[PDB]
């Protein structure tokens, strides 16, 4: 079945360059052309043009002549978009889209890659444990506070993924230009504190990984 999988979000300063990828599977790569479509915050979809996956010839829409380069690694069934001399107005989600038969231009889409053009600095999260002091026959809710990070995302697991039942990881909240997130887990007493419970927090943008054993008190 037909999937286009795009690369992950980028944060870049004005003037810099970014290259994002779109990996295809489920069909013959050179049979259909690949388009790119820009969605800027607060605006609708804008077609950027397409590359002929057989001939290698790209066609650019007017707004996209000069700084944008479409390219291919056909051995890898991958299409690439390179944007040079980044401007503030390049901030957008960029989608690849495959054509279809009988003149469909946008039959299958990738998930989008957010490109942020900003002078904001990458900030690691501070991580705090959320725990009670250690009544009989009650369920205990533990948590993990992940505060003040940029850009998104952070990921959270518990006991390296082996504790999954009772886990809620909640969507991130933007406040004053930093994100905060929390995760909780409800465990039976008496499994805690007799059995250990750790939250594991990764922020790939800052190359950070934090583990926090949850112990009784406050």
């Amino acid at each position: 079945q037909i999937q286009l999988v795009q690369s992950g979000p980028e944060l870049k300063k004005p003037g810099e360059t970014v290259k994002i990828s779109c990996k295809a599977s489920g069909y013959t790569f050179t049979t259909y052309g690949m388009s790119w479509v820009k969605q800027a915050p607060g605006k609708g979809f804008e077609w950027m043009g397409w590359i002929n996956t057989y001939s290698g010839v790209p066609t650019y829409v007017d707004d996209f002549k000069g700084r944008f380069a479409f390219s291919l690694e056909t051995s890898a069934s991958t299409a690439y978009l390179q944007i040079n001399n980044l401007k503030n107005e390049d901030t957008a989600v960029y989608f690849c889209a495959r054509g279809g038969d009988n003149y469909l231009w946008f039959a299958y889409w990738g998930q989008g890659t957010l490109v942020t053009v900003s002078a904001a600095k990458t900030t690691p999260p501070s991580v705090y444990p959320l725990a009670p002091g250690s009544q009989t026959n009650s369920m205990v809710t533990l948590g993990c506070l992940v505060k003040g990070y940029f850009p998104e995302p952070v990921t959270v697991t518990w006991n390296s993924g082996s504790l999954s039942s009772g886990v809620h990881t909640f969507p991130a909240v933007l406040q004053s230009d930093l994100y905060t997130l929390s995760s909780s887990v409800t465990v039976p007493s008496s499994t805690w504190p007799s059995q250990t419970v750790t939250c594991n927090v990764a922020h790939p943008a800052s190359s950070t990984k934090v583990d926090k054993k949850i112990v009784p008190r406050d």
């Binding site: 286009l4 479509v37 609708g44 979809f45 804008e46 077609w47 066609t59 829409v61 989608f95 279809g100 469909l104 231009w105 946008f106 039959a107 299958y108 889409w109 990738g110 998930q111 989008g112 705090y128 444990p129 959320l130 725990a131 809710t141 948590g143 506070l145 505060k147 809620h168 909640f170 969507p171 909240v173 406040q175 905060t180 997130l181 929390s182 909780s184 008190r217 406050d218």
Partner: protein, 204 residues
């Protein structure tokens, strides 16, 4: 929005018929259009091609409740017995040639919400500031809101009883001094017009 015009929002009762409109300008009155669906965290999906005479072809994995029809320059997407999973932004698209060159235009998109869904009320879990944060002179109060449906909640914080499924959360960023100097704080959650609350007690 002049080649293609779409109203930016629409809403329909659960299980009712839904009808969305995309209107073409006079220069493109007879053109065929495509409909797309955009939901968060997923690729956008090609829904259908719709011709001036009202004939159409769908899918994708597009269910039989989606259909199209036409009237002059208007192009309609219809959803029969609309379901909560049909909530999405629906975008219309059209192709053309302008002096020798191929051009494609997308509409501004219509955000569709499905009203009158069965309600599941939220459960709240609150956490006080951790001792680690308090040692740094900071206090974040946490209110986690889970097991509710449908989507959409509003959160207000109270201090001393006065102002100032799906998942949601709210954080109140205080200093350690502000935390220690109240008798209580309260996270108040409004869902489909009903209220649920839970409090934290700096004294405990």
């Amino acid at each position: 929005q002049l080649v293609l015009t779409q109203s930016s929002s629409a809403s329909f009762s659960l299980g009712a018929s839904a009808k969305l409109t995309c209107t073409l300008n006079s220069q493109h009155s007879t053109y065929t259009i495509e409909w797309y669906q955009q939901q968060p965290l997923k690729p956008p999906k090609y829904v259908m091609e719709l011709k001036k005479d009202g004939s159409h072809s769908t899918g994708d994995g597009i269910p039989d409740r989606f259909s199209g029809s036409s009237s002059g320059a208007d192009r309609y997407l219809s959803i029969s017995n609309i379901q909560p999973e049909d909530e999405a932004i629906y975008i219309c698209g059209v192709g053309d040639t302008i002096k020798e060159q191929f051009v494609y235009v997308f509409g501004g998109g219509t955000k569709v919400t499905v009203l009158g869904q069965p309600k599941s009320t939220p459960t709240l879990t609150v956490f006080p500031p951790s001792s680690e944060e308090l040692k740094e002179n900071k206090a974040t109060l946490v209110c986690l809101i889970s097991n509710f449906s449908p989507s959409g909640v509003t959160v207000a914080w109270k201090a001393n009883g006065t102002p100032i499924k799906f998942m949601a959360s709210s954080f109140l960023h205080l200093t350690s001094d502000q935390w220690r100097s109240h008798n209580s704080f309260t996270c108040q959650v409004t869902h489909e017009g009903d209220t649920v609350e839970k409090s934290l007690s700096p004294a405990e």
